[PDB]
Structure 1
Amino acid sequence: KVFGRCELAAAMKRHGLDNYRGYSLGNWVCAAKFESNFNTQATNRNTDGSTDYGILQINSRWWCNDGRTPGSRNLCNIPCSALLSSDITASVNCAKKIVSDGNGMNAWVAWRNRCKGTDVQAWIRGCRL
């Protein structure tokens, strides 16, 4: 599924991501925008052989099992395929663990490079939330 901007903001809020670990909803929408263009089916292979999955491009290196990332962990205890669902629950639950891991949303390099310190409120502006 390709989410609308306000549609995704509303799902993220429903799943308790708005201000999770102090990160406003705008931050999560911004990160999803640049990670996946809001497309739940986004996959991208990394140079190291790991793969990023879903709206927030969660990496098989640590967070999900895809059976093809040697020496990797599955800290969210999910198949990476669960992260491609039109239902964002698994992505949201796993992102909660990732953002709690010590570096906050810096875990998402695109968030650091494209969202951090910007007017992230723009990403939820006009949305009925």
Structure 2
Amino acid sequence: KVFERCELARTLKRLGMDGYRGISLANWMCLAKWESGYNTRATNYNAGDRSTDYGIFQINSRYWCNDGKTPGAVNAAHLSCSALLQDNIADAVACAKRVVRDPQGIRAWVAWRNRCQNRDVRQYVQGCGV
């Protein structure tokens, strides 16, 4: 599914992402925009390390979800990567909150650093009523 901007914003609000581990809703919005353009079916194969990024948040199969074909993903995850390609983003959100529980926080996504960090991200939530 390709979300509309404000439709996603209200959905993330409801799933309790606003201020999760100090990260504002505008920051998660900024992240989804640059990673997948708000598309839950987005997939990116990394030929260099043979891993794949999945879904709206582009979560990687080496440490977070299991897809079986990634080398050195030596078990660990238990969530199937397939769960991150659903139209319902509940699992993807549960997973993104897991990721930021680590020290790096939102900085774990290099796209966040390139495109959102130290920037005015208010634009992503402007007019959504959240």
Bin for the TM-score computed over the shorter chain: over 0.9
Amino acid at match of 1:18: D
Contact 1:63 1:73 in 2 (8 A): no
- Do the aligned partners of residues 75 and 122 (structure 1) sit closer, same or farther apart at CA in structure 2, a change above 3 Å counting? farther
The TM-score, its normalising length taken from structure 1, stands at 0.96
Contact 1:30 1:115 in 2 (8 A): yes
For this pair of structures, how many residues does the alignment match?
A: 129
Alpha-carbon RMSD: 1.2
In the TM superposition, structure 1's runs of 4+ consecutive aligned residues that sit over 3 Å from their partners are 73-76
The CA distance in 2 between the partners of 1:76 and 1:17, in whole Å, is: 21
- Do the aligned partners of residues 75 and 109 (structure 1) sit closer, same or farther apart at CA in structure 2, a change above 3 Å counting? farther
Residue number in structure 2 paired with 1:35: 35
Structure 1 unaligned segments of length 5 or more: list them.
none
Residue number in structure 2 paired with 1:23: 23
Contact 1:65 1:73 in 2 (8 A): no
Secondary structure of 2:7's match? helix
Secondary structure of 1:52's match? strand
Indicate whether 1:113 and 2:107 are aligned: no
Residue number in structure 2 paired with 1:11: 11
**Percent pairwise identity:** 60
Aligned pairs (5 A) from 1:83-102:
83-102=84-103
Contact 1:36 1:42 in 2 (8 A): yes
The TM-score, its normalising length taken from structure 2, stands at 0.95
Contact 1:26 1:123 in 2 (8 A): yes
Deviation per residue, 1:8-62 (Å, 9 max, x gap)? 1111111111110111000000000000000000000112000000000000010
